[PDB]
Amino acid sequence: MLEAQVQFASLWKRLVECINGLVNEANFDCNPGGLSVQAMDSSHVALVHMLLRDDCFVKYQCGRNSILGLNLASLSKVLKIVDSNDSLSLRHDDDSDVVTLTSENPEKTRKCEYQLKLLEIEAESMGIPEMDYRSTVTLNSAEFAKIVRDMQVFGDTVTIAISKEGVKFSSSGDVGQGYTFLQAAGVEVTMEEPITLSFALRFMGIFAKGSTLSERVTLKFAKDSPCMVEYGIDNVGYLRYYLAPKVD
Amino acid sequence: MLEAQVQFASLWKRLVECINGLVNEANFDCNPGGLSVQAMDSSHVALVHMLLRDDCFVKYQCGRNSILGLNLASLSKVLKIVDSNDSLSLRHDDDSDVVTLTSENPEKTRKCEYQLKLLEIEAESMGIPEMDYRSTVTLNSAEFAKIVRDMQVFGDTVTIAISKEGVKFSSSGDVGQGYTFLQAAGVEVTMEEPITLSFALRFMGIFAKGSTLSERVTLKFAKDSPCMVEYGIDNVGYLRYYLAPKVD
Amino acid sequence: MLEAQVQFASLWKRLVECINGLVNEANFDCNPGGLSVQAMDSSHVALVHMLLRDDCFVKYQCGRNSILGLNLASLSKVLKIVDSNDSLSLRHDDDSDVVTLTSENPEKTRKCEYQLKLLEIEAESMGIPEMDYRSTVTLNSAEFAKIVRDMQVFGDTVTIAISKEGVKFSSSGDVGQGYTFLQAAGVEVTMEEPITLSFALRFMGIFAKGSTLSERVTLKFAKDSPCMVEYGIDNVGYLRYYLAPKVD
Numbered sequence A, B, C: 001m002l003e004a005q006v007q008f009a010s011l012w013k014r015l016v017e018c019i020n021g022l023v024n025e026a027n028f029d030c031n032p033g034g035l036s037v038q039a040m041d042s043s044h045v046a047l048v049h050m051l052l053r054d055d056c057f058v059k060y061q062c063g064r065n066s067i068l069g070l071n072l073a074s075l076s077k078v079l080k081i082v083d084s085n086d087s088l089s090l091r092h093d094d095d096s097d098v099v100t101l102t103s104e105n106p107e108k109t110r111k112c113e114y115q116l117k118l119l120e121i122e123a124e125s126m127g128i129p130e131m132d133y134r135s136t137v138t139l140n141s142a143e144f145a146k147i148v149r150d151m152q153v154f155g156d157t158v159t160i161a162i163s164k165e166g167v168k169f170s171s172s173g174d175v176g177q178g179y180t181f182l183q184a185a186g187v188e189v190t191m192e193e194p195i196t197l198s199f200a201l202r203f204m205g206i207f208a209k210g211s212t213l214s215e216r217v218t219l220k221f222a223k224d225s226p227c228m229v230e231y232g233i234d235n236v237g238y239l240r241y242y243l244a245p246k247v248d
């Protein structure tokens, strides 16, 4: 059986939101190292990889590796009612077809218990592309979020140009033609060459909801290669998205 | 001939929003002892009693045991645009066919006068449930209101277990099962029975709007009988809702 | 070679907003006088004159006098993404098909630059009553706004009645009848004959959105005259609406 208590459900609420944006069901891999969702979107273009490390939690027990299919829709619909500042313990007793969240008040005056059915989740097609990333750029997560919401009013394909002295997000639509430019303030560009990719803005949008977790996001790029955008969870996990460049 | 000025219009606004959830039109029973609204919902499962005692107001004139039929659709739409912190004078002149709401700011610089046509509404047979209740829980009005929204993500029916330990709202549906357990002292049980009934959340919802009126709420239960939810309005009135149990 | 840099873009934002209320597109007359929009709604009942004198900018520049046709909806969408507290340099160049907006922060570490197609629009045919204005009445822009959306719960014709006592805003319909009355010698009435006209609230609504600019608002009237509602952009320009009265 697995047991994993978070001090503040804050985290789970902020986390499941991000990943429910990409996929409506995902397998949690629970080894003793910690919890680990790694799923693809249905178009096989974007991949989430989240790791919560054991020291993320106040209580963690997972003797042997169980895999739990959860419906992230339902999980979302529940965590939406769990209070920010309540604790949330997630258990599964090994034989059962259910997982169980339990939410206590600091002052123990109120206890909530919800239980969700597990699923058989079919395809773990996967393949964490991890190549070598030449170009990097790091910025206030919420700025990144605004910039994709901004580029969205124009077209549906942000074009990111990276150069010694800053980064240029450009889009184009019927409304006209935008560009936001961030001078290398703040904004830690640190590349090897000039480098320009483009990207489905739908997905950048799903990823940018990341800003709920980390003051700062990091985008990593390489030619012909999936960008990765990584949100650091404290020093106790990562939410990490990869997305195929647009070509054709 | 009647006039009822209240100092802070907030009271009227919050009240009409409360009973408007349940019914579209209702009779404003005006005695020398106070205003009373008694009204059953169209599906005959659910009752409002609303009393505002004579002291609740500032001016309150009413010899005659005079009645008023009022379109709460209309009344609500008007009270919407009346400043929370303005005076609201409800007047009806020796047999008009219209009520007049009149409104002034403290500084007497703005005056608002609204006129509503009255209805004939048959005073409903309905009558109040007769039971004395031996099982009472009192809890924070807003925690109550949260727990219905909470439970409604699962089902359309909520089971309320009263026990010396405390009340336990359970519900179930497609998403899965939940409950919210409260402990006694937040919460004031007065049981003498392992008594546990079930109820329509559509209605528990409508009721819990009561939170706008009173920081606490009392629920009363008789074995196989209508529950009452009471919202004390200062010590100058009550809003009382009664609802039928779900049974076999 | 037009250039028109405001310092706080919130003005461009708050303006286009008001006037987009009335028309989807509008010519921007750019004398070295300054920018002026002049335009009519589809139904040719209502008129917008706005003028920003050159003193209004921090870098005006306009040798000759170009007209600029703009899709206001396209411009409004772009201006929604622009930060209140940034630069906003406008700019047409000779024979050029496209105008260009250009935000930049105080801290000069984020250049934004957008590019809209110009339209061709049949220059304004009907062009200002240019009247006396017998009756006047100034009052808080925000209260005026409140009062129109008040009278909208009733009907969609407001009857404005002025005497020296104050100004009554009357309105009737299915719900009933309201009148909001304000008092003089903070309501700056002053007429030369009590008169009382009527108007479409549809349009008073669209106007009132000017409350975002001037804190006060001046209404002017005259028997069977196109009323006007003025809004000083403090003193670096104005925004003027004119509306045909409803007549018998």
Ligand SMILES: NC(=[NH2+])NCCC[C@H](N)C(=O)O
Residues within 6 Å of the ligand: A044, A045, A046, A126, A127, A129, A226, A244
């Ligand atoms: N668009 C992608 N995510 N492509 C990834 C490469 C192909 C395949 N997933 C593999 O590496 O085995």
